[PDB]
Amino acid sequence: ERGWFDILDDWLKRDRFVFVGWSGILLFPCAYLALGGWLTGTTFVTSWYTHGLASSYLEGCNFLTVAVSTPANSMGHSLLLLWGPEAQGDFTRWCQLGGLWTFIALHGAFGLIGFMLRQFEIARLVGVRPYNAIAFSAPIAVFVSVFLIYPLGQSSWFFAPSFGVAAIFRFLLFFQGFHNWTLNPFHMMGVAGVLGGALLCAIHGATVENTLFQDGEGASTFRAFNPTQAEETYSMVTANRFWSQIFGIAFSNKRWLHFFMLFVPVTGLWMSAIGVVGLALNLRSYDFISQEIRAAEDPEFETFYTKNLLLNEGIRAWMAPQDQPHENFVFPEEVLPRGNAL
Amino acid sequence: SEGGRIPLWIVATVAGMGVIVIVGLFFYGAYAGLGSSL
Amino acid sequence: ESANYGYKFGQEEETYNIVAAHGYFGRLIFQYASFNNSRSLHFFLAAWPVVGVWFAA
Amino acid sequence: METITYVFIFACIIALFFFAIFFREPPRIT
Amino acid sequence: TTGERPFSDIITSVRYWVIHSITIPALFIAGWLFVSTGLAYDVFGTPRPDSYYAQEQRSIPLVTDRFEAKQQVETFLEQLK
Amino acid sequence: ARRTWLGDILRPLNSEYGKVAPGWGTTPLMAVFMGLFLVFLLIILEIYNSTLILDGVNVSWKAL
Amino acid sequence: MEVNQLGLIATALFVLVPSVFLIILYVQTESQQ
Amino acid sequence: MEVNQLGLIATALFVLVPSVFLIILYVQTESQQK
Amino acid sequence: TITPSLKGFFIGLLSGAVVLGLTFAVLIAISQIDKVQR
Amino acid sequence: SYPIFTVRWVAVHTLAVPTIFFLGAIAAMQFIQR
Amino acid sequence: GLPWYRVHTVLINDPGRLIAAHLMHTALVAGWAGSMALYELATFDPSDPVLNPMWRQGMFVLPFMARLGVTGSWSGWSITGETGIDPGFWSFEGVALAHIVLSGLLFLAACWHWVYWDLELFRDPRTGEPALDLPKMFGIHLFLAGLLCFGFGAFHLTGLFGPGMWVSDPYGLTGSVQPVAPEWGPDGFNPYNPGGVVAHHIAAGIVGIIAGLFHILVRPPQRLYKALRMGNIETVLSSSIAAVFFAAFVVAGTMWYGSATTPIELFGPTRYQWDSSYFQQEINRRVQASLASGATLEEAWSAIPEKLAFYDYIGNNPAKGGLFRTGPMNKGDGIAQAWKGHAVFRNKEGEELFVRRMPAFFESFPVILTDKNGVVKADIPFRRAESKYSFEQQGVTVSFYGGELNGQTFTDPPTVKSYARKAIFGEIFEFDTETLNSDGIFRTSPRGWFTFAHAVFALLFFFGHIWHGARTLFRDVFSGIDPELSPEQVEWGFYQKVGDVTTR
Amino acid sequence: DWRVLVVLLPVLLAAGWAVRNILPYAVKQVQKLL
Amino acid sequence: DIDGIREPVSGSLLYGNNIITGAVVPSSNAIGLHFYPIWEAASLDEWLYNGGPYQLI
Amino acid sequence: EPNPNRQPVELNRTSLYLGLLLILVLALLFSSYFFN
Numbered sequence A: 001e002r003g004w005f006d007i008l009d010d011w012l013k014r015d016r017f018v019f020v021g022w023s024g025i026l027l028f029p030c031a032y033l034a035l036g037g038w039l040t041g042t043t044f045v046t047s048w049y050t051h052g053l054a055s056s057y058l059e060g061c062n063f064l065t066v067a068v069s070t071p072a073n074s075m076g077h078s079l080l081l082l083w084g085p086e087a088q089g090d091f092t093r094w095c096q097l098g099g100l101w102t103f104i105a106l107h108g109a110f111g112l113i114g115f116m117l118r119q120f121e122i123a124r125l126v127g128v129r130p131y132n133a134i135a136f137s138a139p140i141a142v143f144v145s146v147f148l149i150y151p152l153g154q155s156s157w158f159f160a161p162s163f164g165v166a167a168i169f170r171f172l173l174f175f176q177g178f179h180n181w182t183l184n185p186f187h188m189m190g191v192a193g194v195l196g197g198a199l200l201c202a203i204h205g206a207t208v209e210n211t212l213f214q215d216g217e218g219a220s221t222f223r224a225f226n227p228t229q230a231e232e233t234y235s236m237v238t239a240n241r242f243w244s245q246i247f248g249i250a251f252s253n254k255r256w257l258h259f260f261m262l263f264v265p266v267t268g269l270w271m272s273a274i275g276v277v278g279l280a281l282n283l284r285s286y287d288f289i290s291q292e293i294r295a296a297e298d299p300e301f302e303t304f305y306t307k308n309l310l311l312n313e314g315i316r317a318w319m320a321p322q323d324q325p326h327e328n329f330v331f332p333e334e335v336l337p338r339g340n341a342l
Numbered sequence B: 001s002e003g004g005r006i007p008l009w010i011v012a013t014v015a016g017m018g019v020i021v022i023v024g025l026f027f028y029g030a031y032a033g034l035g036s037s038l
Numbered sequence C: 001e002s003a004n005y006g007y008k009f010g011q012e013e014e015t016y017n018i019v020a021a022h023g024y025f026g027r028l029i030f031q032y033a034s035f036n037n038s039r040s041l042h043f044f045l046a047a048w049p050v051v052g053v054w055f056a057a
Numbered sequence D: 001m002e003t004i005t006y007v008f009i010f011a012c013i014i015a016l017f018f019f020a021i022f023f024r025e026p027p028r029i030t
Numbered sequence E: 001t002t003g004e005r006p007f008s009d010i011i012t013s014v015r016y017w018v019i020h021s022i023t024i025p026a027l028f029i030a031g032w033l034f035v036s037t038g039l040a041y042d043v044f045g046t047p048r049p050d051s052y053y054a055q056e057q058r059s060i061p062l063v064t065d066r067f068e069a070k071q072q073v074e075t076f077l078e079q080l081k
Numbered sequence F: 001a002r003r004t005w006l007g008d009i010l011r012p013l014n015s016e017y018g019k020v021a022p023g024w025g026t027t028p029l030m031a032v033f034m035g036l037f038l039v040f041l042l043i044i045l046e047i048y049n050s051t052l053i054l055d056g057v058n059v060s061w062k063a064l
Numbered sequence G: 001m002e003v004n005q006l007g008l009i010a011t012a013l014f015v016l017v018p019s020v021f022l023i024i025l026y027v028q029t030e031s032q033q
Numbered sequence H: 001m002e003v004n005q006l007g008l009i010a011t012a013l014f015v016l017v018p019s020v021f022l023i024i025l026y027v028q029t030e031s032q033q034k
Numbered sequence I: 001t002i003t004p005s006l007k008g009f010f011i012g013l014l015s016g017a018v019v020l021g022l023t024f025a026v027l028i029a030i031s032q033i034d035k036v037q038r
Numbered sequence J: 001s002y003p004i005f006t007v008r009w010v011a012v013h014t015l016a017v018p019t020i021f022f023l024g025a026i027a028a029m030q031f032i033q034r
Numbered sequence K: 001g002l003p004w005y006r007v008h009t010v011l012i013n014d015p016g017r018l019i020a021a022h023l024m025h026t027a028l029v030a031g032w033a034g035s036m037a038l039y040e041l042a043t044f045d046p047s048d049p050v051l052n053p054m055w056r057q058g059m060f061v062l063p064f065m066a067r068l069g070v071t072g073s074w075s076g077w078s079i080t081g082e083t084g085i086d087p088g089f090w091s092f093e094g095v096a097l098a099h100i101v102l103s104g105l106l107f108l109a110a111c112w113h114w115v116y117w118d119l120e121l122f123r124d125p126r127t128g129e130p131a132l133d134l135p136k137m138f139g140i141h142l143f144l145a146g147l148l149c150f151g152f153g154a155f156h157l158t159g160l161f162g163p164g165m166w167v168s169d170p171y172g173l174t175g176s177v178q179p180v181a182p183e184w185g186p187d188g189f190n191p192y193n194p195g196g197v198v199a200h201h202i203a204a205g206i207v208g209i210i211a212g213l214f215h216i217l218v219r220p221p222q223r224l225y226k227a228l229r230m231g232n233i234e235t236v237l238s239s240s241i242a243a244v245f246f247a248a249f250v251v252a253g254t255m256w257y258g259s260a261t262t263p264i265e266l267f268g269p270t271r272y273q274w275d276s277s278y279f280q281q282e283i284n285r286r287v288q289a290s291l292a293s294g295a296t297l298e299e300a301w302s303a304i305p306e307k308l309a310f311y312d313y314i315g316n317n318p319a320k321g322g323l324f325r326t327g328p329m330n331k332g333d334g335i336a337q338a339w340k341g342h343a344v345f346r347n348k349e350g351e352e353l354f355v356r357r358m359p360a361f362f363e364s365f366p367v368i369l370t371d372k373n374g375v376v377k378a379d380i381p382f383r384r385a386e387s388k389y390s391f392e393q394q395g396v397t398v399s400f401y402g403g404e405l406n407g408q409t410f411t412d413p414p415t416v417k418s419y420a421r422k423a424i425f426g427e428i429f430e431f432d433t434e435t436l437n438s439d440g441i442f443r444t445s446p447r448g449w450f451t452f453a454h455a456v457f458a459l460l461f462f463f464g465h466i467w468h469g470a471r472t473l474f475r476d477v478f479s480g481i482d483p484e485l486s487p488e489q490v491e492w493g494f495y496q497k498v499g500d501v502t503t504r
Numbered sequence L: 001d002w003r004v005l006v007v008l009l010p011v012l013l014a015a016g017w018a019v020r021n022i023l024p025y026a027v028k029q030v031q032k033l034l
Numbered sequence M: 001d002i003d004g005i006r007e008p009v010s011g012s013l014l015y016g017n018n019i020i021t022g023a024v025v026p027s028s029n030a031i032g033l034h035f036y037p038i039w040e041a042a043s044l045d046e047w048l049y050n051g052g053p054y055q056l057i
Numbered sequence N: 001e002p003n004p005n006r007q008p009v010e011l012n013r014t015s016l017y018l019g020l021l022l023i024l025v026l027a028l029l030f031s032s033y034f035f036n
């Protein structure tokens, strides 16, 4: 049977400069639209009616302060389809209501699905094991938990991260002040995975480059390697002795070593994702009850834990009126928490 | 027509200088008009 | 059995096929975004986090 | 109670370091 | 190789540069005019420097209803005199 | 293997391992039901979301 | 300090049950030929 | 009832520690060849 | 009753059918013109 | 010898064409005064 | 030998011992439900369904028994407050006991199937190899699922032969188990219409019967069989896990937003009812209707049911807890005893003032009082030296209407500030904090815990689907790639179509 | 709206100028693939 | 007394810290950048009050 | 009637050390939150 399906399959899987595949039907429009929405919004679109903020190059923002901001809190979790009941097909209103944010987030989610299908598709055609796709589950867990589950647990899309540099920084600080997110053991595991992964990246790369075999005569050692050679280009035996004597332990199995490099950052990102699912519900690691009972009763008891909560209380009181304009917070000067003099 | 006429190093040099021109214009704008704080 | 027993400490021959990896990863993006020289690939792995952390410091 | 727990766990880790370094499986070339 | 013409071949060819010495500046100028005619403001609904606030108000025209949001913006836009 | 009264009764039900229909079989019909199911999920999603609003369908506790 | 007192047995079983699992598997591997 | 709270962990370790010792010894006996 | 949003729902359905339809139409066409050699 | 209109040609221009238009729009913004 | 993370693969080709393992898992899950129900019955206080309902007590499986009609105990009480009832055998205790007995029967069955693993039924009659005809098994199991689905909706929920399900008014005041008729019109797809729940199970069950018959009688197309590896049991694991995490996300969402199957009297209020002052608006409407009908302020508020006031309190908001604040909500703010009544604040001019309520985002919140127009008129200052709005300067007093403080007025600043601090939480209640040694810090309800566990499990099971899907489609390279992989298959140009050697 | 024509006109003249310079080879590429 | 204002901060396990809240606390702001070895203190009790251990570590 | 699907299980010494380190470190991390 060589019908139209098989002929289409032939054309999608041609060896061209940019491979396409069946997955490309999903991947390329969604990725291109998510990127184009972000460039269109950060260049031309305001956040005046949703946030009270300028947020485009047109308005005078720079690369650090442009964003595609989230919709107004009054939109709830509306899909904000262009043809939906809020914008009613009006492209200009849709931009002013925050429709580009759901546009980017949803096309981005489906584009990420498409990229992982592409990793599966190409791996099956070339005949490799699909571990690259498996590792990519970690960026997807992060994107889905932070950009979709988290606002879905909260009151509206407004509290999702906005798509911009400084807007993401605001997201970090909001998470410290309101959620005490540095205290969360699921974030801690995420930190260990990301920093541990950076560590492994550097130490593996440096170790290889400094246990090279002399396989050529030039002082530039890059030329002395051939992709089809059968021999290892560096000495695992010398690498093993160096690290055993420097650090006490060393890798001896090169397959274990490279599985471990996959395992560590991937597991870290997955752990951070679980913690953010908790924060969707305000299920925080905010306090240690034993510390609060002692400190309530003993005004001489002070730890770095109690010092940081005072900082969180400052963040909340000082940023909430501007950061949550729909709430209409009016905090007179006299109620604002402040230390001496400052 | 046939690829090869214009040497690549001149292509690279002209394209590079256009990049510098357009990025310098953006930094100029940080101090004038909108977004300049003035 | 664990695939890790398929590598033996000190063996002379490489334990994976870099040409297959490059053929997969070159098609994922495009051919020239992929390394086929293990030495320069590993130099890149060393350089990127080290330079970034120098800037952080 | 809780102080004893924290220090006990810590002390086990330092013991584990000792055996992992000095009583490791020896790497053997072939 | 995958059969397409090499990029270094194309971008050093006179014919490429005959074509793109026109198409590139023409797009650039189209983008400039999109802003300079003021069309960008009206397509996307972005305030001009004189239309964030009315002359004496200092409150944001914040959207507060879901299904009448479109009409709320239009009302805010009238009140700009 | 061990035969049992109940296994003999159930034997026909585990006897066609590997038996397929030629070619594409009923795949196009399956595709039609999948498409209908996708529109169905979209309808109930957007009702819950208040993106699709229907007469007499009040998406609220106030519907008891 | 008024800590949760179940914290002690919770920590103790958290260490002991998976650690014991690993020790059983390891020792019976050594005892094989 | 106002029982001693340490009775729980005392009883749990009393059961678990010598039980685990026996299980270790048994399982490594079974896996010795033949 | 056809509410405005139910009308909007049908417009969304038709638009997506048109987009998917043209996409596969063009793709099937091109695959028939530029076949692989076996 | 080579074709002119390939998939690669389309992918290049779906990115390159809007990029240049946007650079011209942003260049103009540098002369807007309040 | 096998690595520790693969020990269970010995069942892949052993259907009898697979059934045994699946029987043992089922025995464990049933035994958990029985033992969880007994624990909850030993700790549940039935004596106050108004201010101490099950969801204040950390009850997790009790609401699930009540949802489908189990409401009474053999000791004579019911969760709706009745005494002297006879629930028959299907009390909370009878349900727990039945699950315990089922657990033990399934344990014995698991032993039989483990020992007698080599049954002729599991062998292919042509080859004698172990083999399961998964496409036909699917139609048999789907057919049984359709019958069960249909009978659940047609007989249990309608009350035709069964008790029905829990239903209530929009404010969660008068819930009970009632027979429910199906809703066949478009409102049947309204999540808050219990009638749609009945219609769904009748209709989907019929569809499941029909589709089950189809999958019993029609073999899979050769093209789908090869593409989905329908001879490989691991393909069923991969798609089953996908269906399961789909379902888990849905039950997490409907628990968090609310629906006819997650009533507030069983799981507590939703966070969104606090965000939109859902209960506060109903309270105010009833007080208007009384004031309009000539009653005094004290009669209007005293007519508000305590159960309705208790819903208008942030301590019952499931978005106020913490991950390691364990136990029932009663362990936090205490066991609620009585509505204190509605606090009305006035300044020295006699203007009524209103306390700004705490949004769920804030662990703490300042105390700020406005007039009807949202103008700040009083607050509790942090820096005193330039205070202008202090309660002392503004002559703030508080009067109570309804509840136990009905008719009283307080004027001393310390007492007035005390009640204003409580008023940021909504209605004000008296709590017993001694019985459980409550610590005064908010915990989440079973609605919050259910949602968290199931969103987390749904996300993890997504990884399971990816992993087992990958093992199904790449079984041939699980141990490594072909040692004789030709460089030409992976270098560019040699083949026109990637991975197709016939297109050199 | 005249600004729409002012903006598209530089793009439209660019499309027709590249078509002049490429149509001999474009027709030749389409002919070869037939 | 990290900030030199006679307001001591508790950092150790035996004084009410767990693993997450505990610290060795920086030396006092009254010392600034002055070198503070054990032998510059009148006693160990003084050295500990002023955060001597931080410098040594 | 011996079942043919049985297989020996292994945990090598390095895996024991890695496993024990993971469990001890997880305990050291989570214990503070258990005591609260």
Ligand code: CLA
Residues within 6 Å of the ligand: A025, A026, A029, A030, A033, A079, A080, A081, A082, A083, A099, A102, A103, A104, A106, A107, A110, F035, F038, I010, I012, I013, I014, I015, I016, I017, I019
């Ligand atoms: C090809 C991949 C792809 C995918 C997966 C998506 C996905 C999406 N788009 Mg995007 N989009 C795409 C390409 C894609 N788009 C392209 C190429 C363009 C340029 C035109 C756009 C421009 C665009 C805009 C302007 C918007 C979206 C929006 C969306 C979202 C809502 C879509 C929807 O409800 O349609 C529903 C339609 C279908 C599911 C089609 C299925 C048809 C069925 C299967 C067949 C049966 C139909 C039948 C024949 C018709 C009966 C009709 C009759 C009863 C009247 C969704 C995330 C919306 C959004 O982002 O909201 C913020 C939105 O406003 N898209």
Ligand code: CLA
Residues within 6 Å of the ligand: A267, K040, K043, K057, K058, K059, K060, K323, K324, K325, K326, K327, K328, K445, K446, K449, K450, K451, K453, K454, N026
């Ligand atoms: C869906 C599962 C589920 C849910 C939602 C509930 C919900 C509830 N339970 Mg129940 N329970 C369950 C299953 C569940 N239970 C099971 C399986 C058991 C048997 C153990 C119990 C036994 C039980 C008892 C004995 C009690 C409850 C109680 C409660 C209530 C308080 C919960 C609480 O404080 O948790 C606190 C939650 C946490 C502290 C979260 C733990 C986070 C874990 C430890 C993180 C682990 C991380 C891991 C190590 C990292 C791995 C990393 C690695 C992969 C690299 C709440 C209504 C209490 C109650 O009020 O009864 C009236 C009560 O006394 N439950």
Ligand code: CLA
Residues within 6 Å of the ligand: K004, K005, K006, K007, K008, K009, K237, K241, K460, K461, K462, K463, K464, K465, K467, K468, K471
């Ligand atoms: C219906 C669910 C289901 C079933 C019948 C299976 C079955 C299997 N899995 Mg899959 N898997 C699942 C879901 C399932 N899995 C999910 C949700 C995930 C993502 C977390 C995975 C991720 C996964 C991986 C990465 C691997 C498997 C592997 C396997 C195979 C060997 C497992 C083994 O020996 O573990 C032995 C496990 C132990 C001896 C101890 C595990 C202890 C855990 C971590 C903590 C304790 C859990 C607790 C007791 C129960 C919690 C219940 C929970 C639902 C609340 C077996 C075919 C393996 C395989 O493919 O082999 C070739 C393999 O590598 N699975």
Ligand SMILES: CC(C)=CCC/C(C)=C/CC/C(C)=C/CC/C(C)=C/CC/C(C)=C/CC/C(C)=C/CC/C(C)=C/CC/C(C)=C/CC/C(C)=C/CC1=CC(=O)C(C)=C(C)C1=O
Residues within 6 Å of the ligand: A018, A020, A024, A025, A028, A029, A031, A032, A035, C018, C021, C022, C025, C026, C029, C033, C034, C035, C036, C041, C045, I023, I027, J007, J010, J011, J012, J014, J015
């Ligand atoms: C209406 C519509 C659109 C319909 C479409 C339907 C359809 C059929 C479309 C097809 C037609 C088509 C193609 C349209 C195109 C549209 C279009 C242009 C879409 C574009 C979408 C888009 C721009 C996506 C952007 C994606 C993106 C940003 C990619 C970035 C890639 C990037 C930055 C890569 C650099 C990173 C890099 C080099 C990393 C290497 C470092 C690293 C450690 C490697 C490790 C490593 C490497 C090895 O190398 C080997 C060896 C080994 C050992 C090894 O360790």
Ligand SMILES: CCCCCCCCCCCCCCCC(=O)OC[C@H](COP(=O)(O)OC[C@@H](O)CO)OC(=O)CCCCCCCCCCCCCCC
Residues within 6 Å of the ligand: A205, A206, A209, A210, A219, A220, A221, A222, C043, C046, C047, C050, C051
């Ligand atoms: C030349 C300028 C380099 C400045 C920074 C240093 C980068 C290289 C050091 C990384 C250390 C990693 C650990 C050792 C890893 C290790 O062992 O390296 C080994 C690797 C190969 O060594 P060879 O012996 O083959 O060659 C080096 C000499 O021996 C001369 O041949 O060294 C190099 O490649 C040197 C490259 C110099 C040229 C690099 C220029 C990079 C500049 C790029 C611009 C960055 C700007 C970013 C702005 C955001």
Ligand SMILES: CC1=C(/C=C/C(C)=C/C=C/C(C)=C/C=C/C=C(C)/C=C/C=C(C)/C=C/C2=C(C)CCCC2(C)C)C(C)(C)CCC1
Residues within 6 Å of the ligand: A032, A033, A035, A036, A037, A038, A039, A040, B019, B023, J014, J015, J018, J019, J020, J022, J023
């Ligand atoms: C949204 C939307 C859409 C779409 C659109 C699109 C698709 C767009 C695209 C767009 C685009 C696509 C754009 C682009 C742009 C670009 C740019 C703007 C760039 C710039 C650059 C630069 C500036 C650079 C810089 C640099 C760097 C970065 C580094 C190197 C050096 C230098 C300095 C050069 C539609 C219609 C569908 C619908 C509606 C909505």
Ligand SMILES: CC1=C(/C=C/C(C)=C/C=C/C(C)=C/C=C/C=C(C)/C=C/C=C(C)/C=C/C2=C(C)CCCC2(C)C)C(C)(C)CCC1
Residues within 6 Å of the ligand: K028, K029, K030, K031, K032, K035, K100, K101, K102, K103, K104, K105, K107, K108
């Ligand atoms: C034999 C017999 C019997 C008996 C039976 C019985 C007695 C049973 C019981 C059973 C039971 C009594 C069971 C139980 C079970 C349980 C379970 C199965 C559990 C599990 C758990 C879990 C799994 C958990 C987990 C966790 C933790 C711990 C922490 C947090 C997180 C989580 C949740 C994960 C009778 C007489 C009937 C008759 C016949 C014979």
Ligand SMILES: CCCCCCCCCCCCO[C@@H]1O[C@H](CO)[C@@H](O[C@H]2O[C@H](CO)[C@@H](O)[C@H](O)[C@H]2O)[C@H](O)[C@H]1O
Residues within 6 Å of the ligand: G017, G020, G021, G024, G028, G032, G033, H027, H030, H031, H032, H033, H034, K001, N007, N008, N009, N010
């Ligand atoms: C409270 C927490 C406790 C957690 C409980 C943990 C239970 C784990 C049980 C592990 C059991 C391992 O099971 C054990 O496997 C080994 C091999 O691996 C089997 O051993 C078998 O293979 C070996 C290997 O050559 C042969 O030499 C041997 O003669 C044969 O019997 C044992 O017969 C069985 O006892």
Ligand SMILES: CCCCCCCS[C@@H]1O[C@H](CO)[C@@H](O)[C@H](O)[C@H]1O
Residues within 6 Å of the ligand: K334, K414, K415, K418, K419, K422, K429, K430, K431, K432, K433
């Ligand atoms: C100054 C103390 C008395 C003034 C009234 C205080 C607010 S009311 C008070 O709040 C307590 C929680 O803080 C509850 O436990 C208690 O039941 C309730 O009476």
Ligand SMILES: [Ca+2]
Residues within 6 Å of the ligand: J034
């Ligand atoms: Ca001016």
Ligand SMILES: [Fe+2]
Residues within 6 Å of the ligand: A204, A258
């Ligand atoms: Fe490497």
Ligand SMILES: [Mg+2]
Residues within 6 Å of the ligand: A060, B029, B030, B031, B032, B033, B034, B035, B036, J029, J030
């Ligand atoms: Mg400027």
